[PDB]
Symmetry: C5
Subunit: 376 residues, 5 copies
Amino acid sequence: TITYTSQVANARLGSFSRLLLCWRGSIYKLLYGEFLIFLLCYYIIRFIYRLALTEEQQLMFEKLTLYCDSYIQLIPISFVLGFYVTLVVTRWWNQYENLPWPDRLMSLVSGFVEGKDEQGRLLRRTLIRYANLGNVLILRSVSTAVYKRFPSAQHLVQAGFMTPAEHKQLEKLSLPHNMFWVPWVWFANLSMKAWLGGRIRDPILLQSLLNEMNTLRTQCGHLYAYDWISIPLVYTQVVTVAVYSFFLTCLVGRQFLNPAKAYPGHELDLVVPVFTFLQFFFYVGWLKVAEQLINPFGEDDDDFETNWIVDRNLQVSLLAVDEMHQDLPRMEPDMYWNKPEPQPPYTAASAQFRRASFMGSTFNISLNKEEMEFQP
Amino acid sequence: TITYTSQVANARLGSFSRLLLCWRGSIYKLLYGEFLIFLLCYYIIRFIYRLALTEEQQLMFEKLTLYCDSYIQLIPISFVLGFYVTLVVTRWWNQYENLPWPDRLMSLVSGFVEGKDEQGRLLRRTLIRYANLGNVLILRSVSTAVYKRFPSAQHLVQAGFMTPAEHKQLEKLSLPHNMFWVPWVWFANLSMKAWLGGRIRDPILLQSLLNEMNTLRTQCGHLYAYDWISIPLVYTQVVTVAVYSFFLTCLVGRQFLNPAKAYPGHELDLVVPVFTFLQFFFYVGWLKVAEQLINPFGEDDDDFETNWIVDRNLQVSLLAVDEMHQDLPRMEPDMYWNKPEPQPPYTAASAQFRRASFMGSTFNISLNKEEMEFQP
Amino acid sequence: TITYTSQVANARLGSFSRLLLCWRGSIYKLLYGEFLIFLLCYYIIRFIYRLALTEEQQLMFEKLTLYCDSYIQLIPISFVLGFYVTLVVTRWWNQYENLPWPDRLMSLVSGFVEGKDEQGRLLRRTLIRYANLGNVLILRSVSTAVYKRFPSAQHLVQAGFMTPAEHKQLEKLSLPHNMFWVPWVWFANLSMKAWLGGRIRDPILLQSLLNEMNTLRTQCGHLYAYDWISIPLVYTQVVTVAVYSFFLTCLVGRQFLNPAKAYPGHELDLVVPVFTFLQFFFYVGWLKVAEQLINPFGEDDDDFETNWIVDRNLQVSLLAVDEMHQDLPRMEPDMYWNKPEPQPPYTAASAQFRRASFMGSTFNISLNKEEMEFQP
Amino acid sequence: TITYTSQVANARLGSFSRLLLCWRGSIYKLLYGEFLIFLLCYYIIRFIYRLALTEEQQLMFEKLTLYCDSYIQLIPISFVLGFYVTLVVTRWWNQYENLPWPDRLMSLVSGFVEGKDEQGRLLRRTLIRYANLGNVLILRSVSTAVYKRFPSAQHLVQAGFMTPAEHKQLEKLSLPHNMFWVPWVWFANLSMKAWLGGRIRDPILLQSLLNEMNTLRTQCGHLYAYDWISIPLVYTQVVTVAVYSFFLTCLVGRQFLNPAKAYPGHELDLVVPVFTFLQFFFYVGWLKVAEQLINPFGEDDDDFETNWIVDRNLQVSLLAVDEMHQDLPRMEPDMYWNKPEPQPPYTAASAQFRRASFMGSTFNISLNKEEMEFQP
Amino acid sequence: TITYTSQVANARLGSFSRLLLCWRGSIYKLLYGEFLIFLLCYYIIRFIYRLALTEEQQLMFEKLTLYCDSYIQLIPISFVLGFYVTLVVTRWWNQYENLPWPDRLMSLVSGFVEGKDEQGRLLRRTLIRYANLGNVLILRSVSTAVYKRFPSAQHLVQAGFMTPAEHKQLEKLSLPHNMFWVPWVWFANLSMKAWLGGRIRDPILLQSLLNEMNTLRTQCGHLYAYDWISIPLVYTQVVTVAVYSFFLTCLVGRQFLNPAKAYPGHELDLVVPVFTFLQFFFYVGWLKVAEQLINPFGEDDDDFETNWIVDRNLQVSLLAVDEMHQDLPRMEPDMYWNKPEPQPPYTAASAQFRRASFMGSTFNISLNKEEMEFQP
Ligand SMILES: [Ca+2]
Ligand SMILES: [Ca+2]
Ligand SMILES: [Ca+2]
Ligand SMILES: [Ca+2]
Ligand SMILES: [Ca+2]
């Protein structure tokens, strides 16, 4: 993930221009190899034509080049690329939105599961750990970075996400499927046991816990679905064929013919097809957006930070359910105890941001005395 | 379903170009017959123009070819194709999203339905089987593969989804409508009976169970709706006519005219219309995307694996409600029992994915001592 | 509703071509009259130009025809048609999604409202009938077929959807508004009475019933909103003007001028403007899609089957609440009672659909021993 | 709100053509003033060119006209208009979807709040009136028509929406913000008091009431947000300039130059620029769609009927909570008491709408005896 | 935020043209510097070509300009801008929709947390202050203005948002992540303590409170996610490159070539490239819309008023939970106590907005007596 929100906070002079001097997760880094290959092929063709062709062969090449440059359309490429990239971006944001966060569940567990003793600590930590374990199982199923971190369930046990007992239970339950769903059944059964044992004081609280856990399960299932059901290969191939055929044609169409022949278009013989290179950057970067975002759990610069998410979730959830359980800051009257209209101060840097409240678009409408009179 | 997520995890050199060497669920497999027909017709027309026609007939054909080429437009093909395929893909993903997964309901059943005896086992298994039976009924109504697997309710009984008693009950209830809704009424009544019998300890748990079952029912109803209410046939016919008229026009417009006449835009008689063939591949594959995705429950390569989903759902739900009920791994303190900030290790292959936490885009904003001062 | 899902299950040779032989709900049926009028106008103009006009008038008409062609642009018409039709299709699907299905409510009623006696039968049937009556009231307000079936509340009473007592109560309550909301208040009060009288054992069950009823009410309100708030007449008129101006400009710009004059684009004189007729079919069919779908509750072939929905809902809900209440198939051990991994068989037709489970995209990643070792 | 759903129910001959004869909320009514200004400017320029310019000045004007007509196509007017109007229409429908309806809350109040005496009547009426008061407060903040109806809180008191005591309470609570949120706090506190006083029999019922009230509050907050956060003024200005400069250029580029000069496109002097007027209608009406829908709470013909909504909501909610409380039609066996499959009759006008039930797309699949045999 | 809803309430004459006279948040203010740079470059090139070079160099430059003019195409830039800006606008609206409002939670707290004594006041104020503190923490993480107002937790304490005890607790809990999640755990634990102490009378009320708190937490998490996961930098660079390449090729292809050469499209020398500057306006203004909305929490004119939102939320929530708790206006019969159909009056300015109720689109259908008869 490359963040530039602070850089694009305000629309200043050359706001997006300054972003062109970025390397990580950039168009240059994404397409430099493809551009080098295209440039090498283009100049090899130019040489071959200008040095290894007789007069008749040169005339044939000029006719073919004129025909190729004639038969090239940007409309299909722009349409297909725009629609495909829009679909890929929508799926990318959906996949992020289906990343499970244990915050709601951890707050509920910390609040509801009672007991400051070892048994209560164990119960809360085990519940939050089951949530984290389900999340990590799905994450290592769908993300290459997470899989490389935890290439095996033994690695999961070594990292502390799973205990040897949980590992043995999983191996005993093993089916010929992905077993990322097991920790949710474990969580449901453990919560039912906690309620039956008095640790959870109420079936309403039990239902809230299970609703949060089921929301997490739905998110993990959506992640699995996005991993499994790829965008149609036919659609991907159509977009790729359009984009690549455009520049395969350009390799011959955008060739500087001999100026001596005074062809209408090919009057001035440059050496660098600058506009063709600009088109290459534009279209191939548009395709590279989809190439990078199609699987957002790879190891691209703009791919999600799944390992950091896992670490943060584990630490935060464990802290919330163990250290922060029934550990509140002292409750005392605040600074505005007897002030009906509190007004927090502004600093010098923010004094300009003090704005009058918006009272509605009809606030300033003016009406006459006769107009405002109710009729009988 | 064809999966290439592992192949497109990272945006590497020629990432999408490498996907062009795939056969299953590919543009070639989808449109090779249409392309062969188009090629045959095109070359038949070329041979007729070259041999059969006399001088005047050939001149008339050349004028007709110039006019037909002049009247080929791709804006009012690209526009309609893009909009139609976007609609089809949206409906395709919605149809997948409405595939019922019994995971949430199965966790709820395993937790809530009490009793480790034969009666409890039977009750839990019957509830989960009612859910699975409803899912399979809708799936065999909407999916050709599932129908081929279970072409009759007797087949469903033989497969184990339905018991003979349930089959008899369905026969008794038979109405002149699709009876996929009956298992949900059965589930509601059985849950009420279980709660009245003490197996479910609270109406709150009963309500959670029924909410999950009703979510599954809504998903099945959406599947039925998508099966019944097809995309408007007028819209489909409009798209089909656009594409087919474009290429029928190309059949005459893209003929290679005699170089002897030296017309403005041919000047060179190749035998293969390479750009016309590329356009055919592009546009016909764009159409074939919608052709394959319009019914995602057929037997295409990229259609959903409904039979695998059915088998997996049956296995997982039965295991969860039968063997996993009140069967938990031993609860013991974890590896980070007294560690304030757990830090799971990284392997050598994943050490580069360790990142500092993102603290917000305002973290690096710098202010002077006077700027940060609160004002009165 | 025209269904061709079975026909388009698989992407076969000419899958969408086979759909061009359909008449019901087809582009031909939709626009044959408009095409006839356009053809008549075009050929009247052509015959006037060919016979009635003198030499000077014919030269003037040739100038006008050559001048008209530059104003026949397709980019804006395609843009406006695409966006308008996308909006209309989105609204059409939303309108179907707001069609009320009493399945969830009926399952809840059958489960919760207790009593196999006459009083319980009457209570359950009355609740489900209130739901169906509200649905039918909204449907007859918004659908021409349902209105023609039930042109009056007396017709509703005769058809059995309403009792004479309910009709008298509605007439007593009559306000100067659509009274489709009354049955929901009736349902709420009757459910409260049932709970107070012991027929509903718990306020949790009562709340579930009322949540389902309120979901139905929201769907009915959305149907009313779609019926009332039409797409802006300005937008509809703008799209209509675009299409009509395009095709009335074509009436003069697509006339085949005297080939003798040797104008740049009028060498060939075909009596039939095939490409103009193709464009007419394409664009007027695109507009006819919106014309048919703008009101999905009319009597078009692709309009919804509201009458069938009403009949099916009544029958299914009555059966579920009355005969299916606490009438369950015998609970007995299933086929896989003691089979840890059930495996339903495949028929000869579906044997090829047996697929291995998808374990994730990271399953096949290869790592060395050094790569998989944890670092300290 | 202009409704033409009945007119566009069926896709008949000239369905959208017939809508071109409408005046209210029509393109003519929306843009006749702009069209008159444009016509006046166009013909003033025509007379200036034809009567006030010498030979050289007329030659210069003709060159300018040809230049403008050649370079007019540089305006991305269709693109900008489509992409802007789509957003405007989406926001328009969202704003409608956020209009609060008290139907669900009123049914809940009528059912739950008990007591047929004066105290219960007062309680239910006060709750529903708090809901209506919050709705009307937000509506008068965001709607010009509602503000004109109720230009002050004293007007609200006179209209009966608020009592003098409520007005005094609002004045006492006055903060420098919009006080549309106060009635929701009042509703919550009154519901809590009613529950504590025995008028509400269960905290579950109290929670249902508060959930409905909170949904209404969220809708009102969305209305406030839409009123406050206008569409980007930069975007609106870009679209406005794009549309206006097009016709400003047309004023000179679409003039009829002297036919004596025999310019390529100016051989005929047909005084009226019919195609330019058609373009004006198309583009300016496409912009008028956005101009009318950008604030759907103004006084346009297609703007929402906020005053009618307010009146209807008040009447319906008061009736439902006061007259309809525990006032049900007599409950008796219905027409289909012992009919397993009720079949409501059809009229002569609707007999053709009786259809066979749709049983799925796989229903008609035919398989041999061997294909259907289960395999081992 | 710049609001013009009142100005655009009605679609009046020149409604959108009257917005072109605004400066704040305007296209002029956004792009005047870029336009000045473009002007300087264009006229530098013009002066070089006119009087800097010999005749041979002038011919070379003329050929280069005539070549460049054919490469600038509107469709690709327009499409990329449309898709990118649509994505940016959608994300901008979602970001606003994720702004946390404490109104629902504050009403629930005021209703549910009992006690008019100091303990009750402290409990309610502390809960609402925890909600406001979480909101402010996320807002100062994501918003430049809020960060400038509260550049440190000490600033938060001095402003009254956090007590010294809460600051100490946050320091003791400090983890290497953003700690905005802590107040939600605090809220859960404090609500549990209040329920166990009798201040909250029912676990259902506790669950409602925690549901509202969790909704706020999810909104804050979405704000953090939008702050962290920027739109892909590759996509941003692609759009920027498209725009800049277009307007850099324009710098040479839009030069007014010598009219004496009588080039095909350069017969007039206007000095000022009016249409090129109009295109710059349109496209750079589209890009500036995207640039301004990409980070809606910066300090642009059209960025959100986060500081005002913070102040208003604090004041309103404190008032609601402290002064408005169990403080209701006197309950008395309203104006329409015994009026079956209340009819609030209309003023003279709004009398024209009184409309008849819409009874449905089928209301006016006319049927004969024989048509309306039921068939057997
Ligand atoms: Ca990736
Ligand atoms: Ca298919
Ligand atoms: Ca219709
Ligand atoms: Ca308006
Ligand atoms: Ca900004």
